[PDB]
């Protein structure tokens, strides 16, 4: 079990415990000042998603004609729900043009290269929607927190990421960056859900469990990054992710509003929820 | 419309199929499921399917762990007719697998450089490293079906492919990589029904191309190329598993059970695997 | 039947490349064309001697690079027949081909064409220790591509604006980027073309395109100056070489590189001095 | 004498000291004629350059011919350390268009590559239409350096001798023309060229501590050579074996064999000359 300190109070969390203790279970949803008291009605979420998806088919037909290229980054804490936001957007997309980049950790050869090199290799050709599991922003989160990269390297990445993204925007590739937020209790509940589901247990490693008393360590790095890497060229979208249903819908609503695609049905997109989707610093 | 309407011979019987017409004619709609001597009258129960699938996927988590521990490498090839259900079979396999060790290879048309290479060069480029599970959406068997039928390869290149594929697969087997090859069959009416489902679902419409619709009359040619491919390339080192795929639930379940049965993985639970259904999964030519 | 009509600095001549008689006005002017600073070609024995000392320092550079993990890219651009390849071979002849490699990319595929222009060049960037020389670089879009209409004037003007940003990131990373422009005089090009035509070890180096593009000399002069102007920056400076004499061209390319590399075991006496009459910086030299 | 070493030069004990800039006469005077080299002296350099020039003009034809037919060629060069592989390659490629004649110089296997099929990283380098691909080191590092040095397992080395013929059958079935050259030198000759390398500042990087130590492992490598030529010399993959003591004669006859075997358009059989059977032989038993 892990000794913690949740907003002033010292707490005891056993992940191998098949029982979720009261202060996680009852707190998880509202954690981190989540704006809503319960989950989105499911029927209503599913019928919204279908509509958003039918839109995303319009997008991809338009992408194939204009040759328009789109890139989509998803970052967040462990279990913030990057993958479910990714699978929501691509589930009913053509995997020929919409592809998910899942890069393993750098090889030796990749380590002596320009950090951005292996990301460049995955960049879109005419018409491609490229989505990122892990992005070049491991250098602004996991790597300096875990000391997988030097301070100087992290510091260079913060400096180089906007020059990198100016190049992308100047090329006319449309980059989205989504930071997905969850409250501390949610992470714990989700971590626990993974542990006790034989279908999701491979997602945990002892490291992820060791790095639970590194919340603030990660809070620090999050805030540095968003201020320092949110440019006009590369804006950051920040999502409240406690409810995955709301997180998915607003991710897709945001992208749809931002892309000037043929056959765009504004009634079907609806309103990006101001309570859920923000911009850069000042939102969290 | 009636604008893309086409005449078809459905088992020595003439018929017109209009894909843009949102009404599905009874000669398809009522005949789809049992078409081509399908051994069951109804679709596998939805909730039973999901229950069995979950058990099977837990076993796949055991396979993945065993593969990492041992460096073991697997390759799975999925072929069949258009809309046969190759992608759902793959997705059912990898839905709850680690994507950094189970990856899907989906290669696009050959570039100029590639056409001048050895046919297999660009597939070797995707081969597994240790612990990797590689699934092919379209494989090298593109030259055994789609390429000759449409004239994308010469008759000589086809003949040459049928000769070379066994040899290539022997290299794969001697290297210690486990290759599976799945042929997923559906009945003619079921293809049509699926084509129709696709046209009239705005989520699936993109699955249909012009090419797809014209190739509907080329059904008997595909049967020949199919039969000749199974005949020539079913070998000891590279067996064809042949799936009756009218019911996608029984198809996905039996694809996975077969793989689990042939893999000698750690923590294997035969009771959770269950029994491969011999009415659904058969072997090489003659099953079909 | 392949004879071209040309205008050499306010004077009209015809050039038949397939006539083995090199006319006087080429033969007598090839060498000193374009205000070349020297009376004659550098003697062979002295060239070979000096090149040896230079390739020995290149061995020291390689060993330092393997040790410090240092990374170098060397870009070579010029008119046709300038001697880009000769200068690359002079550099790499006595270096380990497993840490010093040459990049010679062919025309872009359908896929590479729909991509970031710089994507396929980034694929070829060095890992630790590596020296990468470019046969044709991203500067084909600041040379052949707009002149020959292979890229749009919008794509050309986009490249001119984007290449210093590219080179900024290269420099920021600490990959040392060398760019050489190899200048030749007009009459020297004609001789070299004719040399290639009438020598069977060299005839494949020609195209009917290169011969057609002889009339395009002044247009190419235009794109040269434009490029050296826009894309000569602090993080990516252009070195300009007078290449009429291939021997002095090669020696100074290497001299420039050794001078700028702060490697262990370096011997200034062995490098000697860069010939300011052969090697200039940026525009305002030609 | 800090890296000096004792050797059994044909049952006769001997001390070689590489870092001594003076070459002992038992090497210097014996190198050229080692391993019963059929000739007394070096091929005259001008005659060599004149011959090479003609061979290279024939190689321009090959290239034009390959581009028009799409014909593909691979050339593998193996031999002991310092046998002369890079030299045979550069004599081939010096006046060829590098846009279609490429030299493959593969570094050690990465970790990813080690868990792949042995041949996968080499298939990645295979020719497209009209390409001529030359290999500095090839897949035959599993037949030689790897077993001897323990970089691969006995099982992997055995695996390799079995698979290489199959691989080469696929290459031949595909219509790609594979040449395989083994370049032999005498023991004394190797030592001389090692010494040349050590004491030439242009060449010293070609020498490694590993290479010096493996000078005792001569007989070891002899065994691997003979066994590899035995198991992998087949009809679809013949080994051409070159006596390479003279680098000029080796380069010339490597090139003549290739010319001789390619039925290229413009072929001037008189310009090719005759392959010297004292220098080039085939498969096992030649040496």
Curated annotation (Swiss-Prot), chain D:
Uses inorganic polyphosphate (polyP) as a donor to convert ADP to ATP. Can also convert GDP to GTP, with lower efficiency. Cannot dephosphorylate ATP in the presence of polyP. SUPFAM superfamilies: P-loop containing nucleoside triphosphate hydrolases. Has low activity with Co(2+) or Ni(2+). Its EC number is 2.7.4.-. Changing residue 251 to A: Almost no change in activity. InterPro entries: P-loop_NTPase (IPR027417), PPK2-related (IPR022488), PPK2_PA0141 (IPR022486). It is an enzyme of class 2 (transferase). Optimum pH is 8.0-9.5. It catalyses: [phosphate](n) + ATP = [phosphate](n+1) + ADP; [phosphate](n) + GTP = [phosphate](n+1) + GDP. This is ADP-polyphosphate phosphotransferase 1. Belongs to the polyphosphate kinase 2 (PPK2) family. Class I subfamily. Keywords: ATP synthesis, Kinase, Magnesium, Transferase. NCBIfam families: PPK2_P_aer.
């Amino acid at each position: 079990a892990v000794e913690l300190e949740i907003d002033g109070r010292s707490r005891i969390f056993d992940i191998d415990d098949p029982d979720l203790p009261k202060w996680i279970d009852e707190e998880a949803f509202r954690s981190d000042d989540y704006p809503y008291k319960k989950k989105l009605d499911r029927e209503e979420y599913e019928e919204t998603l279908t509509k958003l998806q039918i839109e995303l088919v319009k997008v991809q037909f338009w992408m194939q004609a204009t040759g328009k290229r789109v890139m989509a980054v998803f970052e967040g804490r462990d279990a913030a729900g990057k993958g479910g936001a990714i699978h929501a957007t691509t589930a009913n997309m053509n995997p020929r043009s919409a592809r998910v980049v899942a890069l393993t950790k750098p090889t030796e050869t990749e380590r002596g290269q320009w950090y951005f090199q292996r990301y460049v290799a995955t960049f879109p050709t005419a018409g491609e929607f490229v989505l990122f599991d892990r992005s070049w922003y491991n250098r602004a989160g996991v790597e300096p927190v875990m000391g997988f990269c030097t301070p100087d390297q992290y510091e260079q990445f913060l400096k180089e990421a906007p020059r990198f993204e100016e190049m992308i925007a100047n090329e006319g590739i449309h980059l989205f960056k989504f930071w997905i937020n969850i409250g501390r209790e949610m992470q714990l509940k989700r971590f626990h859900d993974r542990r006790h589901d034989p279908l999701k247990i491979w997602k945990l490693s002892p490291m992820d469990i060791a790095a639970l008393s590194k919340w603030d360590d990660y809070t620090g790095k999050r805030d540095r990054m968003l201020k320092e890497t949110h440019t006009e060229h590369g804006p950051w979208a920040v999502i409240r992710g406690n409810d995955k249903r709301r997180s998915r819908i607003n991710v897709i609503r945001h992208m749809l509003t931002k892309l000037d695609y043929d056959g765009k049905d504004e009634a079907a997109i609806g309103e990006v929820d101001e309570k859920i989707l923000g911009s850069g610093p000042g939102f969290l």
